[PDB]
Amino acid sequence: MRECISIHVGQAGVQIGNACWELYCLEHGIQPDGQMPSDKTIGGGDDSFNTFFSETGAGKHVPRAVFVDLEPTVIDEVRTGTYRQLFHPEQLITGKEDAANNYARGHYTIGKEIIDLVLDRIRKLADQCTGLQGFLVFHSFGGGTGSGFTSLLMERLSVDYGKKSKLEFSIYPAPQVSTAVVEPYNSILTTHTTLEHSDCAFMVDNEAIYDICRRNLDIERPTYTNLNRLISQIVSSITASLRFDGALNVDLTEFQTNLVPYPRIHFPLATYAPVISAEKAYHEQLSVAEITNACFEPANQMVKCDPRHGKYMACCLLYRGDVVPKDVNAAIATIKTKRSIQFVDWCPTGFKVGINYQPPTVVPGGDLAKVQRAVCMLSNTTAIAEAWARLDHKFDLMYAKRAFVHWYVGEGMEEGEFSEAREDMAALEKDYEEVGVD
Amino acid sequence: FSATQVFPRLLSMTLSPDLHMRHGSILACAEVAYALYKLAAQENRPVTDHLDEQAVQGLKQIHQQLYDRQLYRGLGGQLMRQAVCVLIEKLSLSKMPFRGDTVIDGWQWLINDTLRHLHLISSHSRQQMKDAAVSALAALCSEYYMKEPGEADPAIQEELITQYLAELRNPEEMTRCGFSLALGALPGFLLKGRLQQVLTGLRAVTHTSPEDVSFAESRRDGLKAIARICQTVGVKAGAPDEAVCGENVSQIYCALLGCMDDYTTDSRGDVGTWVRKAAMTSLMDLTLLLARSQPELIEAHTCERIMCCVAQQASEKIDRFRAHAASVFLTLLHFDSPPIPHVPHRGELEKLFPRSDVASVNWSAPSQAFPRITQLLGLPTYRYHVLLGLVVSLGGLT
Amino acid sequence: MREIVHIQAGQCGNQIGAKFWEVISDEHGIDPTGTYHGDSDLQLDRISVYYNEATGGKYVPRAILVDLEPGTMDSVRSGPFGQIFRPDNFVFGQSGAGNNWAKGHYTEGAELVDSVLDVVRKEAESCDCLQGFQLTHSLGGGTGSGMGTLLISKIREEYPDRIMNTFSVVPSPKVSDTVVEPYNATLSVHQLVENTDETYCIDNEALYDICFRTLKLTTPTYGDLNHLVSATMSGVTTCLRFPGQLNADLRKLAVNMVPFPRLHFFMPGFAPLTSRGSQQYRALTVPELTQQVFDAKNMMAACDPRHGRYLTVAAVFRGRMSMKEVDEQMLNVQNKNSSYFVEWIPNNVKTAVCDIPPRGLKMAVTFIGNSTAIQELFKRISEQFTAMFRRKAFLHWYTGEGMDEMEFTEAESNMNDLVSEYQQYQDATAE
Ligand SMILES: Nc1nc2c(ncn2[C@@H]2O[C@H](COP(=O)(O)OP(=O)(O)OP(=O)(O)O)[C@@H](O)[C@H]2O)c(=O)[nH]1
Ligand SMILES: Nc1nc2c(ncn2[C@@H]2O[C@H](COP(=O)(O)OP(=O)(O)OP(=O)(O)O)[C@@H](O)[C@H]2O)c(=O)[nH]1
Ligand SMILES: [Mg+2]
Numbered sequence A: 001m002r003e004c005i006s007i008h009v010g011q012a013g014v015q016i017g018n019a020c021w022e023l024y025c026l027e028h029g030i031q032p033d034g035q036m037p038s039d040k041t042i043g044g045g046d047d048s049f050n051t052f053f054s055e056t057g058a059g060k061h062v063p064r065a066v067f068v069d070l071e072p073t074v075i076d077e078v079r080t081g082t083y084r085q086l087f088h089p090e091q092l093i094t095g096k097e098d099a100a101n102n103y104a105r106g107h108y109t110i111g112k113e114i115i116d117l118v119l120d121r122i123r124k125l126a127d128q129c130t131g132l133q134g135f136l137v138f139h140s141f142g143g144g145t146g147s148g149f150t151s152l153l154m155e156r157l158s159v160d161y162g163k164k165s166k167l168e169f170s171i172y173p174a175p176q177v178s179t180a181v182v183e184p185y186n187s188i189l190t191t192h193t194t195l196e197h198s199d200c201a202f203m204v205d206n207e208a209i210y211d212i213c214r215r216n217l218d219i220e221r222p223t224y225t226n227l228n229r230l231i232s233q234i235v236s237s238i239t240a241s242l243r244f245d246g247a248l249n250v251d252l253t254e255f256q257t258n259l260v261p262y263p264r265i266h267f268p269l270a271t272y273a274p275v276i277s278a279e280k281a282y283h284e285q286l287s288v289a290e291i292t293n294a295c296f297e298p299a300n301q302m303v304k305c306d307p308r309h310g311k312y313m314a315c316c317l318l319y320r321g322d323v324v325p326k327d328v329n330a331a332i333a334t335i336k337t338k339r340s341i342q343f344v345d346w347c348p349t350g351f352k353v354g355i356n357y358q359p360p361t362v363v364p365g366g367d368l369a370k371v372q373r374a375v376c377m378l379s380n381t382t383a384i385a386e387a388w389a390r391l392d393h394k395f396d397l398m399y400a401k402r403a404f405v406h407w408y409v410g411e412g413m414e415e416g417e418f419s420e421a422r423e424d425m426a427a428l429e430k431d432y433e434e435v436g437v438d
Numbered sequence B: 001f002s003a004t005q006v007f008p009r010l011l012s013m014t015l016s017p018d019l020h021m022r023h024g025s026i027l028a029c030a031e032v033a034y035a036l037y038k039l040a041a042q043e044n045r046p047v048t049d050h051l052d053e054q055a056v057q058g059l060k061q062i063h064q065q066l067y068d069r070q071l072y073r074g075l076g077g078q079l080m081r082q083a084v085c086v087l088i089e090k091l092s093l094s095k096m097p098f099r100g101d102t103v104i105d106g107w108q109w110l111i112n113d114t115l116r117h118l119h120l121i122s123s124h125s126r127q128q129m130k131d132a133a134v135s136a137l138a139a140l141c142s143e144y145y146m147k148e149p150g151e152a153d154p155a156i157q158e159e160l161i162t163q164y165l166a167e168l169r170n171p172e173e174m175t176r177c178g179f180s181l182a183l184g185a186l187p188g189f190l191l192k193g194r195l196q197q198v199l200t201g202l203r204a205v206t207h208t209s210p211e212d213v214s215f216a217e218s219r220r221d222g223l224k225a226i227a228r229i230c231q232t233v234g235v236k237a238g239a240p241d242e243a244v245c246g247e248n249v250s251q252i253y254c255a256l257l258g259c260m261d262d263y264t265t266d267s268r269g270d271v272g273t274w275v276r277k278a279a280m281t282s283l284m285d286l287t288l289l290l291a292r293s294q295p296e297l298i299e300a301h302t303c304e305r306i307m308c309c310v311a312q313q314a315s316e317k318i319d320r321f322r323a324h325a326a327s328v329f330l331t332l333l334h335f336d337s338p339p340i341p342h343v344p345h346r347g348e349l350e351k352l353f354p355r356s357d358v359a360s361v362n363w364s365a366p367s368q369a370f371p372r373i374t375q376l377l378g379l380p381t382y383r384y385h386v387l388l389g390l391v392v393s394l395g396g397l398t
Numbered sequence C: 001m002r003e004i005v006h007i008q009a010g011q012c013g014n015q016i017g018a019k020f021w022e023v024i025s026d027e028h029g030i031d032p033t034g035t036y037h038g039d040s041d042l043q044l045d046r047i048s049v050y051y052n053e054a055t056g057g058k059y060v061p062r063a064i065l066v067d068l069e070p071g072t073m074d075s076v077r078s079g080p081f082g083q084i085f086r087p088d089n090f091v092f093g094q095s096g097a098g099n100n101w102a103k104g105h106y107t108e109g110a111e112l113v114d115s116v117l118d119v120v121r122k123e124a125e126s127c128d129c130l131q132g133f134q135l136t137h138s139l140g141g142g143t144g145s146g147m148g149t150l151l152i153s154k155i156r157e158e159y160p161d162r163i164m165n166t167f168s169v170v171p172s173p174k175v176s177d178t179v180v181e182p183y184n185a186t187l188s189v190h191q192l193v194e195n196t197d198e199t200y201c202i203d204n205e206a207l208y209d210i211c212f213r214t215l216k217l218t219t220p221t222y223g224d225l226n227h228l229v230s231a232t233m234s235g236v237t238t239c240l241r242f243p244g245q246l247n248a249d250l251r252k253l254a255v256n257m258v259p260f261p262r263l264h265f266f267m268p269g270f271a272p273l274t275s276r277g278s279q280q281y282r283a284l285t286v287p288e289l290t291q292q293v294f295d296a297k298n299m300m301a302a303c304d305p306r307h308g309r310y311l312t313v314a315a316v317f318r319g320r321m322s323m324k325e326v327d328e329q330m331l332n333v334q335n336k337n338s339s340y341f342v343e344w345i346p347n348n349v350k351t352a353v354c355d356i357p358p359r360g361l362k363m364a365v366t367f368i369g370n371s372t373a374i375q376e377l378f379k380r381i382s383e384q385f386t387a388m389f390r391r392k393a394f395l396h397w398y399t400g401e402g403m404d405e406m407e408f409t410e411a412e413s414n415m416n417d418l419v420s421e422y423q424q425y426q427d428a429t430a431e
């Protein structure tokens, strides 16, 4: 077996990791204090949950996570939370100054006096693992800290841990849920600084998840808490491939070979179904075909795009719960007869399907109901490039008058970094269209 | 003592890893070299009399040492480039024995790379690098790049101008902003025969197009380089490819009169004003040049148009630009050595703007400018353009 | 816990700082002895931003007062609240700068600048995490004009990662008849542009005209202007001392309100306008306050916000108004079809809502915008700076201390470039 370490960064990152760990504990049955009455061993090596959690002699389960934040406002609440005895104090690192929505800070001003300590803490967890696969980064492009500090840590690790995979779960900023006016600069800087430090990266449109929570879940004003509970489901469905004894994308290296054909292109679209509310629990029973067909709905997609107007390079379907291959064959045939999608003839990868005998789970009194089946579709299509087009519009307009640019150059940054980052974005956009040439 | 005891210590200090140490050593090597050259120029003695050949080899290896270590990066890259520019300028201004060596090629490549990558440099020190690189190139192109008196090496003339004309069509606006001045700062013997091509390439940039809308800094440098070329070549009849004459003066004046009507309003604001600034001085130094050689070339219609445009530009709500406009107008009106022809209402203009009211009146202050500019409405010629220019100030925002 | 170090220099600077501290102490509920006696828990969740928690539950201010002349020092030491300021935070000499900028920045004010750095450094060592320094002085004089610039230039070299905010008080011929004021103002602005991220301009002519017309006072003294200055200061620093949804720190506020490096001068204001003595007379509402925040009469500078573009807009409300009621009012004034619509109240404005109201008033409002009209404050000093420079009047005093015409022409060129940039940006496309 092989272990894994999740490195969370920023406010959004730390808020998403707590919910993910809570969902994992509710699924595997881990108690708040860290006691698995079903486990019949004291140490890890023969079970299956040892990839994410770590066992000790006293039966305590210490989640393999490295939470690092600059503002202690959120870490103080995360420490005194319900799972105070779960996470180790050494894993939680806090700073003394906030970036205040700035990348040149989270990277050079506030990222220099914290990086020398983050590595010493990550080494303590890396030495305990006999075979580490890679890293599971959780941050957001909007937040200045979550972007700058994450990019600094990523490249810092590229030197030491070079022969290790790298993953990401960023959150694409939206105009409605915007905390900074410099969101476009930080995003275009972090996408260019770590375009080579990420083997695979997942983007979460704040608009798509908000619309999903407002329509599907039927919520008036979905708060960050509700948006984090919904993303936890997708995170668990994605990590089930490595947590359980499955047979599809069991290792982080398999993600770069079955989803990321081109090293440069590493932004695969993801979708998860169904999305039933708690009130309408036993209202309707959707079979595998319905949930598989709902994946092709722009409203249900995690990012606002139009895959219909684009080719497909790699596609991976993952079923969870009561699902039989006989029923999955019906959906596979319907995808071809009813629906129709083209494919890139120059792409090596193709279509893959997998099933896992693990039913879903929801938090007591939550927003989502305990459905009987779940489906997760990961498709790498060029349509996602549209999401990168609008992002370049705002940045370009702002840098046309060079507003809020002096605040970055005067914090350990050069004026040429912006030109380099948008020259890289232009090249990526051009390659996105060149890959989908008839 | 400075040539036998201090120069060796400044030649070794350049290998210092310290960044503040290398800049100082380069500046000292340049200054002491210039001083020794000036001292030797008194006794019409060569520059190698004070400095030995061992020290001379240092001046050649200083560039190789900087190119090998790749010190032209980071924050100190701009400082190193600025220091090397001044060093090369002071070396070329002293007539060193470096002509026909790889050192000249290295200096040219470094100057091209510096004039090639300008957007990467901060805006707080871009004008210095732009005005130093062009000066160094001119000193090098007016010292080393020559085959005989009155001529130059054709191998370099057939490539430098070609590369520059292929660099004046660069989408990046900072590339043209740096290449126009570099091409315009060339000497007169290096423009013989290739003057028409340079003028056409510079005029192609001054023309506005759908793609070049907010390209004001490039158009400003395009006019600045044209003015520099006109001032350098001078005037010479029967030679349109060697200097300015009556065969191409009309086309040159047309390009200068067309940029004055630029009133672009980008997101930054009224940036077009910049394009007008260089468009005014370019119309001044030129009008005087002909006045000091062939004043008959200046036409009456063109002179009247320039006068009316300057009068309109000297009555704008802006204060910094109106001051320069009034200064240019006064310099053009008071110029009487020889007097400039085609001056509309010359007696009335002289009576309304005497010589004593030039340095005592503050044109930047509207109070000490509008009372004297409004009187121009009495004249017929200075009525339409003057009123059009004053309407902007009589109904603006300030 | 972000702390801020407050510094005061010059007679006017110290007089303004004392009043501002007294106001923010009376509003927080702190008796002049040092203990706490308020009746609200919100007056302690952010008291550490400007008060150190010493032994015995006492709150020690952080005001570092410096003055070459031993005048205002003794007055503040024996004031209504003089017993609050630490006693070794007072740094003074005997003879000042004699209304010369080259005295309080080179020969005299640079003699106590070393004791100032030791004091400001001893005060910051106790803080857990410093955010940014602060200074309150007047462009008029030498110890306010030269000492402030010297300290701003000396602190930026040792703390480049700290915000630098000032409260320059531009003088006016109506308040003072001194003739060596234009030079001191020009030289101060020359240094307050290349080493300052934010500067709150409080022109004296505006307050003089307000006291002459609005308040209808007989002979407006310095106290009437100091009261308004302290009121505006307390209204501006409302988010940095009380909770709220808009948790805009100093750096975040400077980044969101100052898009350009050189352009950073604001036009602070405050409403309703009152005076000393009585105050309770008429209770204002939210519509009336919004209609009055954006009037050129409620501004503390001689500038018309309507005549000029709007770089960044911001407003802070104080009283029982709700951010929901404020948003309803801020979304109907940026619409033409809407009734009682205004053309000078711009769009994308920043807005806040406070609970603790000011002293002697139940509802108030503060405006912190940056309009191009502020250029008028820079041109009025330009003219007076040129007419006196051509004749070289009172220039021997400057040339004898060490200064030269080089610095004068550099400051003149900088002011001209700033005015030109302001005029150019004033004419910009809205969309
Ligand atoms: N999905 C999601 N987005 C979040 C969350 N918290 C913040 N965001 C978004 O992320 C961006 C701001 O990032 P933050 O995490 O607040 O920034 P930071 O990493 O704390 O760094 P600073 O800039 O110093 O505050 C905005 O687009 C927010 O809307 C969260 O819990 N979930
Ligand atoms: N609003 C206001 N302006 C003041 C006050 N005191 C002085 N001024 C103005 O500030 C200028 C004088 O500067 P001061 O602060 O008195 O001088 P200083 O900074 O102590 O400097 P020196 O004269 O060199 O000792 C004049 O324009 C005064 O009108 C005050 O209490 N309030
Ligand atoms: Mg944060």
Ligand SMILES: [Mg+2]
Binding pocket: C010, C011, C069, C096, C143
């Ligand atoms: Mg005094």
